[PDB]
Amino acid sequence: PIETVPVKLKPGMDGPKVKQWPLTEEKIKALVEICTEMEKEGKISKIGPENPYNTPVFAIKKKDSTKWRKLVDFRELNKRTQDFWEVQLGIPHPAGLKKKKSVTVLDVGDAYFSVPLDEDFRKYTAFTIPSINNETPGIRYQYNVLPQGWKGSPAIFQSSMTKILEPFKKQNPDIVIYQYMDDLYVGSDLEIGQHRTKIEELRQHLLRWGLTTPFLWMGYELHPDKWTVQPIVLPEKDSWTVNDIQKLVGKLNWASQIYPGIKVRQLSKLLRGTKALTEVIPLTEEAELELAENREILKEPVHGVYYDPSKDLIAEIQKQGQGQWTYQIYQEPFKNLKTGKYARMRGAHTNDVKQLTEAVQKITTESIVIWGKTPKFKLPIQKETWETWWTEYWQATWIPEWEFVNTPPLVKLWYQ
Amino acid sequence: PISPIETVPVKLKPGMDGPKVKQWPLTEEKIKALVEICTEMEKEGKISKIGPENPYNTPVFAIKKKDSTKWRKLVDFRELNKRTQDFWEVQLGIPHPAGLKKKKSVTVLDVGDAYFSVPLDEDFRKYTAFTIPSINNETPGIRYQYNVLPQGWKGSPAIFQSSMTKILEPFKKQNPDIVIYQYMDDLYVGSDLEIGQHRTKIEELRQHLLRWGLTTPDKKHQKEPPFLWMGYELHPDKWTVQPIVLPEKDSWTVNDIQKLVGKLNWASQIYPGIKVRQLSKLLRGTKALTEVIPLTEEAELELAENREILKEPVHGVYYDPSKDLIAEIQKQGQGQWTYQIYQEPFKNLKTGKYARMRGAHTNDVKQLTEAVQKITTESIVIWGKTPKFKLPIQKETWETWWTEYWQATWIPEWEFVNTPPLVKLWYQLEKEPIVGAETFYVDGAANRETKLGKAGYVTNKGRQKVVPLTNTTNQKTELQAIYLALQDSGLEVNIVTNSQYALGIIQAQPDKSESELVNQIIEQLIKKEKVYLAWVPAHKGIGGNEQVDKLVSA
Numbered sequence: 001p002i003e004t005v006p007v008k009l010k011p012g013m014d015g016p017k018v019k020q021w022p023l024t025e026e027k028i029k030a031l032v033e034i035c036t037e038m039e040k041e042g043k044i045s046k047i048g049p050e051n052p053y054n055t056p057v058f059a060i061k062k063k064d065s066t067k068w069r070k071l072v073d074f075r076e077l078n079k080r081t082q083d084f085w086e087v088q089l090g091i092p093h094p095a096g097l098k099k100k101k102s103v104t105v106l107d108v109g110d111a112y113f114s115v116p117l118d119e120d121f122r123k124y125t126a127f128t129i130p131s132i133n134n135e136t137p138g139i140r141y142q143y144n145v146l147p148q149g150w151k152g153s154p155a156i157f158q159s160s161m162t163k164i165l166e167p168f169k170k171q172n173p174d175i176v177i178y179q180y181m182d183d184l185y186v187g188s189d190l191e192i193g194q195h196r197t198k199i200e201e202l203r204q205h206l207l208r209w210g211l212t213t214p215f216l217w218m219g220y221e222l223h224p225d226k227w228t229v230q231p232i233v234l235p236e237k238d239s240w241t242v243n244d245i246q247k248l249v250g251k252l253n254w255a256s257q258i259y260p261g262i263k264v265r266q267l268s269k270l271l272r273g274t275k276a277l278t279e280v281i282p283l284t285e286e287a288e289l290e291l292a293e294n295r296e297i298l299k300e301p302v303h304g305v306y307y308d309p310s311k312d313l314i315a316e317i318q319k320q321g322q323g324q325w326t327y328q329i330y331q332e333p334f335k336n337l338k339t340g341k342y343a344r345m346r347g348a349h350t351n352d353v354k355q356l357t358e359a360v361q362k363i364t365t366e367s368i369v370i371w372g373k374t375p376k377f378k379l380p381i382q383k384e385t386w387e388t389w390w391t392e393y394w395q396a397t398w399i400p401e402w403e404f405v406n407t408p409p410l411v412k413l414w415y416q
Numbered sequence: 417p418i419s420p421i422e423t424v425p426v427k428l429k430p431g432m433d434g435p436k437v438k439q440w441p442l443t444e445e446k447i448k449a450l451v452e453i454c455t456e457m458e459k460e461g462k463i464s465k466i467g468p469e470n471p472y473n474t475p476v477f478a479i480k481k482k483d484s485t486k487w488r489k490l491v492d493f494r495e496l497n498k499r500t501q502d503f504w505e506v507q508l509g510i511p512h513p514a515g516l517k518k519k520k521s522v523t524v525l526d527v528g529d530a531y532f533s534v535p536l537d538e539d540f541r542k543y544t545a546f547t548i549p550s551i552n553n554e555t556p557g558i559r560y561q562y563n564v565l566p567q568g569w570k571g572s573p574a575i576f577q578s579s580m581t582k583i584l585e586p587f588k589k590q591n592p593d594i595v596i597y598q599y600m601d602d603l604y605v606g607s608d609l610e611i612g613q614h615r616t617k618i619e620e621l622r623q624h625l626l627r628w629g630l631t632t633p634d635k636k637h638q639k640e641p642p643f644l645w646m647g648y649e650l651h652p653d654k655w656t657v658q659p660i661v662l663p664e665k666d667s668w669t670v671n672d673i674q675k676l677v678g679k680l681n682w683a684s685q686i687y688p689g690i691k692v693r694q695l696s697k698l699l700r701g702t703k704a705l706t707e708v709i710p711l712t713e714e715a716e717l718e719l720a721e722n723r724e725i726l727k728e729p730v731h732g733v734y735y736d737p738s739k740d741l742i743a744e745i746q747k748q749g750q751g752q753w754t755y756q757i758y759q760e761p762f763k764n765l766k767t768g769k770y771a772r773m774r775g776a777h778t779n780d781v782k783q784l785t786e787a788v789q790k791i792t793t794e795s796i797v798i799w800g801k802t803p804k805f806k807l808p809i810q811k812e813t814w815e816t817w818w819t820e821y822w823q824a825t826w827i828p829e830w831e832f833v834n835t836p837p838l839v840k841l842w843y844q845l846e847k848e849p850i851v852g853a854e855t856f857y858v859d860g861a862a863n864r865e866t867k868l869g870k871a872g873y874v875t876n877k878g879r880q881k882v883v884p885l886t887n888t889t890n891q892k893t894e895l896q897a898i899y900l901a902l903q904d905s906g907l908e909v910n911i912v913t914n915s916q917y918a919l920g921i922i923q924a925q926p927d928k929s930e931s932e933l934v935n936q937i938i939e940q941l942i943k944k945e946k947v948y949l950a951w952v953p954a955h956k957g958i959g960g961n962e963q964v965d966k967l968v969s970a
């Protein structure tokens with residue numbers, strides 16, 4: 001008896017028509033079982049070929065979780081779906097969530113299945129389950145309720161959400177709550193033990209509406225107050241070589257695209273002759289200060305760089321070797337909003353893909369907390385290699401946009 | 417009494433009407449044999465006649481069935497297919513016998529008149545109209561409309577293919593002891609029951625289909641092995657592809673090579689060691705389908721080596737989930753690779769090849785990585801799991817490569833197999849400048865208009881060179897400059913260039929290139945004992961870079 005909220009696609013855009021990609025045995029079984037139970041419970045319903053739309057579907061296991069979780073790649077549908085900020089169902093972003101000592105991430109996607117989906121919009125949620133060795137043609141379904149991973153689910157459902165959290169918010173006015181896709185971000189300044197208790201309070205509070213009307217019991221801890229940035233650094237050497245100064249000049253020349261005040265004249269003077277790379281040349285009086293004055297400029301912040309909510313976020317990542325990984329986040333090139341470095345992640349020293357996947361998840365998490373947006377990634381990897389292994393290591397309930405690049409490292413710019 | 421198959425609702429594309437095409441000119445022999453076919457379709461209930469209130473019609477013709485006296489009826493629904501809604505095809509791939517598990521009892525039977533046993537949507541039948549000349553367009557002929565899925569309509573495949581699945585759904589669920597592979601109207605049925613109970617279930621299935629109106633003629637009913645299925649011959653303990661006929665013509669046209677290369681691709685799935693490089697090179701260019709190509713000495717040696725393989729009959733085995741999957745790869749030169757997938761030694765589930773030459777510069781490691789990724793995806797499709805890999809590359813070689821390469825890369829669980837030619841890296845650039853090695857500052861420059869250029873270097877020891885160049889580019893000169901420094905240096909050398917382009921190529925450690933200039937640099941790099949490349953920004957007044965830029969520019 002719940003009236004449906006109407007939905008439309010962006011004017012002049014068809015629905016998603018994406019092929020399903022091959023799935024492993026273990027993953028097909030999980031989906032077949034999961035989709036048999038959703039069909040019974042009326043959350044999905046079988047369809048035929050007359051529905052021309054399709055979306056990919058696979059299964060994942062969140063960190064330290066043993067049971068499967070259906071994951072739909074609604075990236076295409078989300079881009080073709082109406083922007084709900086214009087509908088005023090857009091969720092505002094709190095600027096104080098990134099300041100808290102602790103932040104837990106709760107998967108509330110299971111709640112979206114309680115709300116029906118506009119009949120005229122259900123055909124855009126079509127997906128197909130494949131079979132090993134193509135024993136059976138595709139088994140196609142479509143959603144009758146708000147699907148997990150669709151950008152319209154949290155929007156339509158927010159009105160019901162604020163109700164459930166009204167008593168908890170009034171009892172705990174210092175806690176900050178933020179909703180992004182199937183996730184709920186809860187943060188406070190309490191001690192660890194006191195924090196984790198207030199989360200279990202929020203959980204049972206959700207059961208009190210679950211009894212009233214993947215699973216809710218899981219939670220992941222963040223500590224945004226401990227996040228640091230990776231700035232550009234110039235090495236501190238007591239003796240320099242021709243090679244050291246040649247790399248330094250190139251780096252300073254590249255850096256000047258970001259910091260306008262950088263100068264290399266007095267340093268270039270040291271490279272006047274035609275010398276061997278290994279020759280040690282001292283630093284002139286003018287050069288020492290030029291280096292020191294450039295170091296100073298790299299301490300202070302870039303001018304005129306700030307966040308624009310109307311602009312997409314881009315993120316670049318560089319493989320530095322030895323399990324080190326650097327990244328930068330920006331909206332306009334050379335106006336970086338944040339830079340960082342990751343190291344010793346899972347896969348270190350044996351699996352590049354596992355490390356890069358973990359890095360994409362790490363970076364997206366930080367963009368959600370800080371700005372409420374997922375960035376499009378420029379991944380340093382060959383397309384076919386990424387599309388062969390990335391699903392074997394994905395542990396998040398969302399999927400960001402990405403593109404592939406090949407930029408050899410001529411300047412070790414973000415690492416030494 | 418047949419049970420009715422629920423129609424699939426179908427539409428045209430928005431703002432589009434039905435098809436209106438006049439009949440094509442039709443020869444007497446074709447005009448006459450067809451009118452015989454139409455009346456029979458009206459009998460069995462496949463077609464209705466009334467037309468005057470129906471403005472639509474689609475062309476029709478007829479070609480002789482393959483070396484048969486019979487005349488086949490086809491409708492050119494290409495105009496209707498444009499105006500018909502898009503479908504989502506549910507056929508995502510083809511089954512492969514290597515993915516089949518051995519069974520004690522087997523059957524293969526087809527559905528008679530697949531498309532014409534399923535009803536078309538009531539409202540869409542009007543658009544399937546068509547017109548046939550009476551007697552050479554002398555009189556006003558007979559009109560008709562389809563009442564079932566017609567041949568040539570883009571919706572007929574997907575629709576029947578899905579309807580067939582709904583009919584089977586109850587049977588599979590109430591007989592989990594059975595395995596049914598369904599590909600269009602073809603049904604493979606296996607189980608470990610006693611053949612009596614198998615023939616029983618097959619009759620229960622045989623009647624269950626007839627209940628929805630799907631016949632299963634005994635002509636298409638295979639009872640005794642070998643079973644013909646999906647182009648293979650299924651014996652109890654081994655499967656094999658049906659015979660392969662390679663053209664033996666002495667004068668080769670383009671299309672003959674295309675046909676030749678096509679069969680070797682199909683052949684590569686079971687016959688190990690197939691190559692198609694030199695035969696495909698013959699087709700590179702705008703050569704028409706009729707041009708006679710003389711086979712090069714390399715293409716004649718390859719076509720001969722392929723026939724040597726196909727002389728002996730090869731068979732593959734079936735899948736045993738209790739066992740691991742092993743995939744072994746071998747290099748065959750000229751960017752070609754072959755692999756075998758098996759669980760027991762010398763008993764291949766299947767084989768294949770990978771000859772893709774992607775990019776202007778490459779090395780064997782990259783290609784090996786691409787063959788692993790192709791084999792992996794193929795293995796997930798057929799068996800749902802990744803195999804263990806046996807590669808002709810040493811752990812030390814691979815460790816050096818991926819740890820130093822700047823893009824992410826990886827290979828799953830794998831072990832080394834000493835089966836030459838092994839994959840190796842032919843040179844390794846130094847990470848730090850070389851003490852005591854001469855330092856070459858190189859640069860190049862070409863005139864965008866005249867295409868004349870210069871390349872050269874200056875060194876810390878006072879060594880210099882400059883060479884004039886004709887019909888060149890800034891990119892080539894910047895490479896020629898590096899090449900000069902490599903030729904004119906000792907076994908150990910430092911090199912400094914401002915060419916982002918030349919450095920991006922070399923640092924990837926290519927062993928082969930479509931540019932001979934690059935190949936020459938590679939040949940040099942393999943001879944050196946220590947090389948250190950370095951990059952500097954151009955026109956910043958640095959070191960010998962400033963000096964050599966004047967030599968080649970002015």
Ligand SMILES: OC[C@H]1O[C@@](CO)(O[C@H]2O[C@H](CO)[C@@H](O)[C@H](O)[C@H]2O)[C@@H](O)[C@@H]1O
Nearest residue numbers: 018019056073075076387400401402403
């Ligand atoms: O990853 C690119 C590859 O994936 C496909 C199909 O999954 O498209 C996906 O990747 C895009 C980049 O993030 C998404 O924007 C797109 O919506 C998503 O389906 C293919 O189109 C492409 O080959």
Ligand SMILES: [Mg+2]
Nearest residue numbers: 859914954965
């Ligand atoms: Mg220059």
